[PDB]
Amino acid sequence: MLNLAEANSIETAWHRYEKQQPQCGFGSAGLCCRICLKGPCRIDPFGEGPKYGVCGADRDTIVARHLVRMIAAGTAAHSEHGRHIALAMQHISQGELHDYSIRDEAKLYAIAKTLGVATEGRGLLAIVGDLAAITLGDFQNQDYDKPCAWLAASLTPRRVKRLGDLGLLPHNIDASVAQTMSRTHVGCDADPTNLILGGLRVAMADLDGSMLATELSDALFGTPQPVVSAANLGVMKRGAVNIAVNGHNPMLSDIICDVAADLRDEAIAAGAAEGINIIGICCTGHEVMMRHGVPLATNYLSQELPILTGALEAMVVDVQCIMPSLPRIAECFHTQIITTDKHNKISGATHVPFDEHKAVETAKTIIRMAIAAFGRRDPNRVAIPAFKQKSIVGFSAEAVVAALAKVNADDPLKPLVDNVVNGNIQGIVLFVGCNTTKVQQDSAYVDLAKSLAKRNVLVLATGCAAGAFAKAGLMTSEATTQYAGEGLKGVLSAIGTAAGLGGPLPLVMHMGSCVDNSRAVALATALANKLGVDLSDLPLVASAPECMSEKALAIGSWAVTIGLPTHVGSVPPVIGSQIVTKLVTETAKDLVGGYFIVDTDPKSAGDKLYAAIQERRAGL
Amino acid sequence: MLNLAEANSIETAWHRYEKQQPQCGFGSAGLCCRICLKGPCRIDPFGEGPKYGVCGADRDTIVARHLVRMIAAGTAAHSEHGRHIALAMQHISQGELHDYSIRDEAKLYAIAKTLGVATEGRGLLAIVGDLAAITLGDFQNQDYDKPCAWLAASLTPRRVKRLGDLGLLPHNIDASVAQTMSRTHVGCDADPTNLILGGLRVAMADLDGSMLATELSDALFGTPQPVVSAANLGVMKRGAVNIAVNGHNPMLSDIICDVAADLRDEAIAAGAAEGINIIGICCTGHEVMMRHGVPLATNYLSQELPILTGALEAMVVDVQCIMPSLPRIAECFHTQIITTDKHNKISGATHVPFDEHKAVETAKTIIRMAIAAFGRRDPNRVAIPAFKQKSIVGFSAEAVVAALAKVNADDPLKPLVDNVVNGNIQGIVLFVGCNTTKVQQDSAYVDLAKSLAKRNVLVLATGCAAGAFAKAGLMTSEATTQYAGEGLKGVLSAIGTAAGLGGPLPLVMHMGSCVDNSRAVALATALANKLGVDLSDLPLVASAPECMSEKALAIGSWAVTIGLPTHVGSVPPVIGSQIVTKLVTETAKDLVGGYFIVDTDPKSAGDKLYAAIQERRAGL
Ligand code: SF4
Ligand code: SF4
Ligand code: SF4
């Protein structure tokens, strides 16, 4: 926890959770079913109740069909973000979408290198078209046996073989989601094993979306490089127009950032002495935190609380992980919750649609409204907590290897590799996932982080996990000296002073939004290649102690298919099926290297994670 | 009904249904969300308790989001069928796939006239090459404002403009299923009106898949023409090896049927003096019956009873509506449940994969596995009820027009309209639907047809609904002379005796499988184009007295969006929201012209349907 801005008149996410107590144990068990209108069909595993549904389907085919349908939804969620980015890149290539451009042409040529596109003497718009045509191809191929272009280009070669031999390499992101929906229909795919393999194949179609999203978003806006930022509710200035950007797509926020600069004088004119101060919520808040250093107000669960300070002039949303309660809560104040997307309206908000073509003028309209919301701000109701915590963020996979080249420009990975074979770094944990109410907010992350840090493992974080470490200052050079542990701290401070920081590198390491989890794969696959090996051999581990979204389920599943022991700290609906639970814990260990780790205890989970790393080290 | 193989000590669909009593009711009203792993949050409508989910979404977001995902899983189910035909038509245009070919070169040409393929002096394979490309574009177009190819080309140009101006013409089948699962992810679309409107678009994609599948499948296997067949379990033979074909895809069955004939001389040699008995279950059987007249054993709920006869040697199952209990109901006997699709495997059943490049060869293998099970049939455990109801089927839209051309070959549609303005044909009804255990099998189907036919309205049917009418004897000439009203019986008898068949046209005309519901919208659009109107003005109505599947919910949802008053007889999860209910029942009569009629009383349904039929006659 952290802030505690007591409503005392208003329902919040914590209130609505307790009024749901107790929650249906059937659904939490995975023994609920509503796929056809002959249900609802439940399974009584014990006292001689119904052991089958009207379908004839058992507990295992019921639990599994819902597992992969959840993975499929999270894949559809991530892929819709990457599709907008690739559709842009196709418009940038055709002299259209003028408000956008290739702001990082260095990242663009490197993307075309990993994809095989010629760049020598070709001109920018030709490469961009070759890059958009390929990336759109992953959304339209019908040859079930042709892997996704980004997957084949971006994994280790050993992994590409392992999955293609099992048919786990997707051919089409849209078709993977749709073929998962169709096969889980009433009376279609039954076999729990065929089902779970079908969820792992569509989990890879999520990885594709996350890769092409991160890479082409860099080329659109710039690769993150280390920057100083600040987190928590304190970053709201009373003397400023406070604009919260919540959602996922930086195509809106990165434009709002630039327009917020030229529009400062209108903020001062309306009576805001400190201009307009835009703040970030959730993954779009991380995108502009990663890139431009814009502060991060809060992560997921505490996203209604900015309106509670009585000084949020407008919260601009687009898609995903935004709470439908926000038009209700903002009606008690002056706040303007502004929806933007064609496929993301909240009843009671204010919709201004984002014409990507007319981008910077739609921004002005948005900021003009929030300047006018400042006009109706009640001044004796402002109550901003003074919690602002600083954090060094912007640690893209590119920048991390750059700071290593301040230690060895010849072999930039050699310090990392050498410091692993000797034990200063026992391993790497990547903290992923959102916020759940069945885990005390931010506590499981911080418990796990310092426990594993102390054990000499490097911590990387993304999304609402990096947001939970951002606040509570584990993203500081000081957090490294206090909790790292000697061997881990010795290296962390070496690179930390090689690149001009001021101390060591922060304990945890921001890599960005959930799609930017593809950065750590790029980090790890290059490592796995330097050693001439695969990720199912590296002392590498993922952990989602507080996960909820279907994205978190899809993200975690391809973390298994890639080779990582993946810790889940919020129990998916599998416990009702011992057979499915065997499939993802055992069996996965053998087929695909990675495996799941379901533990609700942050202390005992970090014991299995270190054990997984220590077992992983032994294999070398 | 009528058969019911009351078998002792074996569990069936009805036995498994009654084990589930009572079923949740929260899920029946749609007041259980189940998306985000912080739930399952449920809504209490009356006595205090929880009024929201933890994300903050009200009952109307929870209800709308689940309905819209059922529409998407139903579109994915049908679209995957259509994509198989389209890929086959592409291997066909290139010289791959030597077992399949353009059997109805005629159909191929009329499919190309409309939809705009140029034919003038062009080889057949160039014409079917353009057809394969255009149709595959409906699965890969990324221009959001580019309507689907078939949709624009196939339904009335007035409805093209309406749905276009409402934004309901889909641009891509695969991306409509995906953008649906994404926008219904946690924290995404929440406005009830927006969600159900987006579900109306992913429903118009099920019309696309159904359209291309039906039309293209005809060119590959032949456009159905009137054929006499037989229905019910009495279609099995003890002196023949009985092979059942369940599922949906005709690409398998049509082969199996042809190969069975060439493999008759090996059957008799093994002891099957009557050869290969290929019986049909669900839609695969409907496809081959409509085209070749093969017998249909049963529909959905009674697909396990053919095993109880002790005379089923194999059940070759491909995709969709295949009960997972069948492998368990075998073993008890000698039957071989044989799965074929890589995305449709059932634990305990024998899987031999179906390569379409090696269709006939695979076919022979399957059939041989059954002629081996014939030599394992316990002859002391045979029990074929001997219910063989003769059925006249094969009534494609083309066949209907031809019969109306045997009376007026200059204005073939004039006999229809004239008899609708005078009153002899008060209207038409399309009976779609499956089979649910909450309504006695086939009961409401039969009752609703007779009550309406007496009121002088033509009865058309598809799928398991048509199977119910076939096994009941409403698909014969005598049924018209008995239950049809005077005016209707007159027109039917005239066209009949004028188009051979020596009698009146069947009371219920078999229009085909689920995808063949596009034949009814074809006939309707043609009549509406002869009268200068839209389907929203024709006295046309759809009814699903025993729906249960997601495909049916989608099949009914595009019927509403094309302008048809649709009746549902199983109550979708919608009662929990009066807003969503009103949106799909009342405000749809203002936006898209069609609407839903939830009743569940078969008597009150027909009264309301006839009221709508007569209301459409007020106009015109
Ligand atoms: S539908 Fe299933 S998860 Fe929802 S309350 Fe009922 S038993 Fe529980
Ligand atoms: S799909 Fe089968 S197990 Fe699921 S609700 Fe329907 S009848 Fe029950
Ligand atoms: S999206 Fe909201 S209502 Fe639905 S399960 Fe999650 S928290 Fe509950």
mmCIF file of C-alpha atoms in Angstrom, chain B residues 378-599:
data_model
loop_
_atom_site.group_PDB
_atom_site.id
_atom_site.type_symbol
_atom_site.label_atom_id
_atom_site.label_comp_id
_atom_site.label_asym_id
_atom_site.label_seq_id
_atom_site.Cartn_x
_atom_site.Cartn_y
_atom_site.Cartn_z
ATOM 1 C CA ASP B 378 -22.080 -57.994 -31.307
ATOM 2 C CA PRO B 379 -25.113 -59.213 -33.300
ATOM 3 C CA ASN B 380 -27.001 -59.933 -30.056
ATOM 4 C CA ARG B 381 -26.888 -56.215 -29.147
ATOM 5 C CA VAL B 382 -28.421 -54.716 -32.320
ATOM 6 C CA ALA B 383 -31.482 -52.479 -31.990
ATOM 7 C CA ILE B 384 -32.447 -50.241 -34.935
ATOM 8 C CA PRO B 385 -35.813 -48.629 -34.021
ATOM 9 C CA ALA B 386 -36.914 -48.710 -37.717
ATOM 10 C CA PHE B 387 -38.077 -45.075 -37.874
ATOM 11 C CA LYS B 388 -37.526 -44.064 -41.518
ATOM 12 C CA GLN B 389 -39.452 -40.894 -42.396
ATOM 13 C CA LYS B 390 -39.173 -40.122 -46.105
ATOM 14 C CA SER B 391 -38.039 -36.554 -46.726
ATOM 15 C CA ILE B 392 -38.014 -34.355 -49.825
ATOM 16 C CA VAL B 393 -35.107 -31.912 -49.585
ATOM 17 C CA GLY B 394 -32.604 -30.062 -51.756
ATOM 18 C CA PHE B 395 -34.441 -26.732 -51.910
ATOM 19 C CA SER B 396 -31.750 -24.182 -52.633
ATOM 20 C CA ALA B 397 -32.749 -20.643 -53.551
ATOM 21 C CA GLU B 398 -31.815 -21.528 -57.135
ATOM 22 C CA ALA B 399 -34.090 -24.581 -56.994
ATOM 23 C CA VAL B 400 -36.978 -22.489 -55.644
ATOM 24 C CA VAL B 401 -36.650 -19.968 -58.486
ATOM 25 C CA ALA B 402 -36.560 -22.813 -61.018
ATOM 26 C CA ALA B 403 -39.826 -24.268 -59.712
ATOM 27 C CA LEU B 404 -41.332 -20.776 -59.905
ATOM 28 C CA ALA B 405 -39.993 -20.713 -63.479
ATOM 29 C CA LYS B 406 -41.942 -23.865 -64.374
ATOM 30 C CA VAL B 407 -45.078 -21.739 -63.874
ATOM 31 C CA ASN B 408 -43.807 -18.355 -65.165
ATOM 32 C CA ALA B 409 -40.466 -18.625 -66.972
ATOM 33 C CA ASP B 410 -40.601 -14.905 -67.881
ATOM 34 C CA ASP B 411 -41.209 -13.391 -64.420
ATOM 35 C CA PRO B 412 -40.308 -16.329 -62.145
ATOM 36 C CA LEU B 413 -40.798 -14.225 -59.021
ATOM 37 C CA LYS B 414 -44.233 -12.952 -60.125
ATOM 38 C CA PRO B 415 -45.993 -16.159 -58.923
ATOM 39 C CA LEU B 416 -44.550 -15.507 -55.459
ATOM 40 C CA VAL B 417 -45.272 -11.786 -55.049
ATOM 41 C CA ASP B 418 -48.748 -12.031 -56.618
ATOM 42 C CA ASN B 419 -49.680 -14.718 -54.087
ATOM 43 C CA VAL B 420 -48.311 -12.524 -51.275
ATOM 44 C CA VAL B 421 -50.205 -9.363 -52.218
ATOM 45 C CA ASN B 422 -53.462 -11.311 -52.570
ATOM 46 C CA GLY B 423 -53.042 -13.076 -49.226
ATOM 47 C CA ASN B 424 -52.552 -16.733 -50.143
ATOM 48 C CA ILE B 425 -48.993 -16.425 -48.809
ATOM 49 C CA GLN B 426 -49.297 -14.181 -45.759
ATOM 50 C CA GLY B 427 -45.546 -14.363 -45.262
ATOM 51 C CA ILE B 428 -42.462 -16.502 -44.899
ATOM 52 C CA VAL B 429 -40.651 -17.848 -41.850
ATOM 53 C CA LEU B 430 -37.089 -19.194 -41.674
ATOM 54 C CA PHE B 431 -36.695 -21.777 -38.908
ATOM 55 C CA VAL B 432 -33.112 -21.683 -37.680
ATOM 56 C CA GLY B 433 -31.825 -23.218 -34.470
ATOM 57 C CA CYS B 434 -30.220 -26.190 -32.747
ATOM 58 C CA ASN B 435 -31.492 -28.424 -29.936
ATOM 59 C CA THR B 436 -31.613 -27.528 -26.244
ATOM 60 C CA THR B 437 -32.341 -29.727 -23.237
ATOM 61 C CA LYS B 438 -34.481 -26.972 -21.676
ATOM 62 C CA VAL B 439 -37.119 -27.484 -24.399
ATOM 63 C CA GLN B 440 -38.348 -30.935 -25.441
ATOM 64 C CA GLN B 441 -36.491 -31.996 -28.577
ATOM 65 C CA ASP B 442 -38.151 -30.786 -31.802
ATOM 66 C CA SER B 443 -41.392 -30.066 -29.922
ATOM 67 C CA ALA B 444 -41.587 -26.286 -30.337
ATOM 68 C CA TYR B 445 -40.262 -26.563 -33.906
ATOM 69 C CA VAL B 446 -43.127 -28.795 -35.049
ATOM 70 C CA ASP B 447 -45.801 -26.886 -33.121
ATOM 71 C CA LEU B 448 -44.696 -23.454 -34.347
ATOM 72 C CA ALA B 449 -44.563 -24.536 -37.997
ATOM 73 C CA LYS B 450 -48.074 -26.018 -38.066
ATOM 74 C CA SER B 451 -49.661 -23.122 -36.165
ATOM 75 C CA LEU B 452 -48.064 -20.733 -38.659
ATOM 76 C CA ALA B 453 -48.629 -22.817 -41.807
ATOM 77 C CA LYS B 454 -52.343 -22.914 -40.958
ATOM 78 C CA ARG B 455 -52.168 -19.099 -40.936
ATOM 79 C CA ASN B 456 -50.982 -19.257 -44.590
ATOM 80 C CA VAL B 457 -47.251 -18.559 -44.229
ATOM 81 C CA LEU B 458 -44.487 -20.470 -45.993
ATOM 82 C CA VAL B 459 -42.099 -22.397 -43.736
ATOM 83 C CA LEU B 460 -38.394 -22.575 -44.545
ATOM 84 C CA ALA B 461 -35.814 -24.235 -42.326
ATOM 85 C CA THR B 462 -32.127 -25.075 -41.971
ATOM 86 C CA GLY B 463 -29.862 -27.094 -39.699
ATOM 87 C CA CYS B 464 -31.106 -29.158 -36.773
ATOM 88 C CA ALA B 465 -34.423 -27.318 -37.059
ATOM 89 C CA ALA B 466 -34.869 -28.719 -40.568
ATOM 90 C CA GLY B 467 -33.697 -32.082 -39.249
ATOM 91 C CA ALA B 468 -36.545 -31.924 -36.741
ATOM 92 C CA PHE B 469 -39.047 -31.277 -39.538
ATOM 93 C CA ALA B 470 -37.476 -34.035 -41.650
ATOM 94 C CA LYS B 471 -37.703 -36.701 -38.932
ATOM 95 C CA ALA B 472 -41.283 -35.559 -38.213
ATOM 96 C CA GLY B 473 -42.670 -35.776 -41.743
ATOM 97 C CA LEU B 474 -43.331 -32.080 -42.268
ATOM 98 C CA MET B 475 -40.829 -32.307 -45.160
ATOM 99 C CA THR B 476 -43.195 -34.225 -47.449
ATOM 100 C CA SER B 477 -45.970 -33.454 -49.904
ATOM 101 C CA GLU B 478 -48.694 -34.969 -47.709
ATOM 102 C CA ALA B 479 -47.822 -32.612 -44.843
ATOM 103 C CA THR B 480 -48.815 -29.664 -47.038
ATOM 104 C CA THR B 481 -52.181 -31.197 -47.941
ATOM 105 C CA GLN B 482 -52.838 -31.810 -44.223
ATOM 106 C CA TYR B 483 -51.594 -28.903 -42.088
ATOM 107 C CA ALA B 484 -51.241 -26.065 -44.612
ATOM 108 C CA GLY B 485 -53.930 -23.432 -44.879
ATOM 109 C CA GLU B 486 -56.001 -23.229 -48.046
ATOM 110 C CA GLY B 487 -54.216 -20.258 -49.605
ATOM 111 C CA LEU B 488 -50.752 -21.613 -48.832
ATOM 112 C CA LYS B 489 -51.654 -25.192 -49.792
ATOM 113 C CA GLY B 490 -52.892 -23.862 -53.134
ATOM 114 C CA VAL B 491 -49.719 -22.051 -54.189
ATOM 115 C CA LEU B 492 -47.523 -24.878 -52.888
ATOM 116 C CA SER B 493 -49.519 -27.540 -54.741
ATOM 117 C CA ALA B 494 -49.453 -25.544 -57.986
ATOM 118 C CA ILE B 495 -45.684 -24.976 -58.142
ATOM 119 C CA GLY B 496 -45.212 -28.578 -57.035
ATOM 120 C CA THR B 497 -47.375 -30.294 -59.646
ATOM 121 C CA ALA B 498 -45.933 -27.925 -62.257
ATOM 122 C CA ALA B 499 -42.333 -28.764 -61.261
ATOM 123 C CA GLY B 500 -42.916 -32.530 -61.233
ATOM 124 C CA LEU B 501 -42.744 -34.230 -57.808
ATOM 125 C CA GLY B 502 -46.401 -35.239 -58.334
ATOM 126 C CA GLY B 503 -47.972 -33.291 -55.489
ATOM 127 C CA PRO B 504 -47.636 -30.168 -53.360
ATOM 128 C CA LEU B 505 -44.346 -28.623 -52.354
ATOM 129 C CA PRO B 506 -43.148 -29.703 -48.877
ATOM 130 C CA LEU B 507 -44.609 -27.783 -45.956
ATOM 131 C CA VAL B 508 -41.086 -27.139 -44.669
ATOM 132 C CA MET B 509 -38.555 -26.637 -47.469
ATOM 133 C CA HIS B 510 -35.024 -27.710 -46.539
ATOM 134 C CA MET B 511 -32.808 -24.709 -47.314
ATOM 135 C CA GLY B 512 -29.671 -26.384 -45.984
ATOM 136 C CA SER B 513 -27.145 -26.205 -43.161
ATOM 137 C CA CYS B 514 -26.439 -23.232 -40.888
ATOM 138 C CA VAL B 515 -24.272 -21.489 -43.484
ATOM 139 C CA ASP B 516 -27.038 -22.198 -46.010
ATOM 140 C CA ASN B 517 -29.239 -19.728 -44.129
ATOM 141 C CA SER B 518 -27.599 -17.378 -46.641
ATOM 142 C CA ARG B 519 -29.894 -19.000 -49.216
ATOM 143 C CA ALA B 520 -32.968 -17.575 -47.472
ATOM 144 C CA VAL B 521 -31.487 -14.073 -47.355
ATOM 145 C CA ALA B 522 -30.642 -14.576 -51.037
ATOM 146 C CA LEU B 523 -34.241 -15.422 -51.962
ATOM 147 C CA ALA B 524 -35.482 -12.591 -49.737
ATOM 148 C CA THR B 525 -33.109 -9.975 -51.162
ATOM 149 C CA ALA B 526 -34.182 -11.067 -54.649
ATOM 150 C CA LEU B 527 -37.872 -10.674 -53.795
ATOM 151 C CA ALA B 528 -37.171 -7.379 -52.018
ATOM 152 C CA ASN B 529 -35.281 -6.245 -55.124
ATOM 153 C CA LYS B 530 -38.203 -7.207 -57.368
ATOM 154 C CA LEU B 531 -40.515 -5.129 -55.149
ATOM 155 C CA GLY B 532 -38.095 -2.221 -54.690
ATOM 156 C CA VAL B 533 -37.966 -2.675 -50.914
ATOM 157 C CA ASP B 534 -35.685 -4.016 -48.180
ATOM 158 C CA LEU B 535 -35.993 -7.119 -46.013
ATOM 159 C CA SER B 536 -37.216 -4.751 -43.280
ATOM 160 C CA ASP B 537 -40.402 -4.338 -45.363
ATOM 161 C CA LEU B 538 -40.979 -7.927 -46.492
ATOM 162 C CA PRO B 539 -43.346 -10.161 -44.454
ATOM 163 C CA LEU B 540 -40.277 -12.234 -43.549
ATOM 164 C CA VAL B 541 -39.549 -13.545 -40.054
ATOM 165 C CA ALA B 542 -36.955 -15.822 -38.446
ATOM 166 C CA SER B 543 -37.491 -18.177 -35.508
ATOM 167 C CA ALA B 544 -35.087 -20.108 -33.254
ATOM 168 C CA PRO B 545 -37.422 -22.083 -30.963
ATOM 169 C CA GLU B 546 -34.635 -24.229 -29.452
ATOM 170 C CA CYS B 547 -31.401 -22.264 -29.823
ATOM 171 C CA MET B 548 -28.395 -22.964 -27.609
ATOM 172 C CA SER B 549 -25.237 -22.267 -29.619
ATOM 173 C CA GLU B 550 -23.168 -19.134 -30.122
ATOM 174 C CA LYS B 551 -23.530 -19.546 -33.896
ATOM 175 C CA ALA B 552 -27.311 -19.333 -33.526
ATOM 176 C CA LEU B 553 -27.013 -16.185 -31.405
ATOM 177 C CA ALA B 554 -24.914 -14.704 -34.208
ATOM 178 C CA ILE B 555 -27.223 -16.140 -36.882
ATOM 179 C CA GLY B 556 -30.114 -14.386 -35.162
ATOM 180 C CA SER B 557 -28.145 -11.171 -34.683
ATOM 181 C CA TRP B 558 -27.401 -10.629 -38.371
ATOM 182 C CA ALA B 559 -31.017 -11.557 -39.118
ATOM 183 C CA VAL B 560 -32.004 -8.609 -36.918
ATOM 184 C CA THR B 561 -29.438 -6.327 -38.558
ATOM 185 C CA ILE B 562 -30.633 -7.212 -42.078
ATOM 186 C CA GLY B 563 -34.155 -6.285 -40.981
ATOM 187 C CA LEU B 564 -35.842 -9.509 -39.849
ATOM 188 C CA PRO B 565 -38.009 -9.829 -36.724
ATOM 189 C CA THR B 566 -36.173 -12.723 -35.070
ATOM 190 C CA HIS B 567 -37.698 -15.000 -32.428
ATOM 191 C CA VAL B 568 -35.527 -16.652 -29.773
ATOM 192 C CA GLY B 569 -36.852 -19.505 -27.664
ATOM 193 C CA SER B 570 -34.111 -20.081 -25.099
ATOM 194 C CA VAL B 571 -33.598 -16.609 -23.517
ATOM 195 C CA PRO B 572 -30.009 -15.353 -23.964
ATOM 196 C CA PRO B 573 -28.170 -13.876 -20.959
ATOM 197 C CA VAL B 574 -29.917 -10.517 -21.341
ATOM 198 C CA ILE B 575 -32.774 -10.466 -18.815
ATOM 199 C CA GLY B 576 -30.419 -8.930 -16.247
ATOM 200 C CA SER B 577 -30.286 -5.641 -18.189
ATOM 201 C CA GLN B 578 -33.429 -3.808 -19.270
ATOM 202 C CA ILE B 579 -31.190 -1.459 -21.274
ATOM 203 C CA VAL B 580 -29.609 -4.223 -23.367
ATOM 204 C CA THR B 581 -33.018 -5.899 -23.650
ATOM 205 C CA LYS B 582 -34.616 -2.700 -24.964
ATOM 206 C CA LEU B 583 -31.634 -2.123 -27.263
ATOM 207 C CA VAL B 584 -32.056 -5.484 -29.023
ATOM 208 C CA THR B 585 -35.884 -5.505 -28.903
ATOM 209 C CA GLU B 586 -37.219 -1.961 -29.393
ATOM 210 C CA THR B 587 -34.530 0.543 -30.428
ATOM 211 C CA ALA B 588 -33.419 -1.924 -33.115
ATOM 212 C CA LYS B 589 -36.796 -1.447 -34.826
ATOM 213 C CA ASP B 590 -35.649 2.180 -35.234
ATOM 214 C CA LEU B 591 -31.973 1.691 -36.182
ATOM 215 C CA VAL B 592 -31.825 -1.487 -38.292
ATOM 216 C CA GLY B 593 -35.516 -2.357 -38.687
ATOM 217 C CA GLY B 594 -35.316 -5.864 -37.252
ATOM 218 C CA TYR B 595 -35.688 -6.897 -33.631
ATOM 219 C CA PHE B 596 -35.696 -9.825 -31.212
ATOM 220 C CA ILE B 597 -38.756 -11.607 -29.797
ATOM 221 C CA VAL B 598 -37.917 -13.548 -26.622
ATOM 222 C CA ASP B 599 -40.926 -15.609 -25.558
#
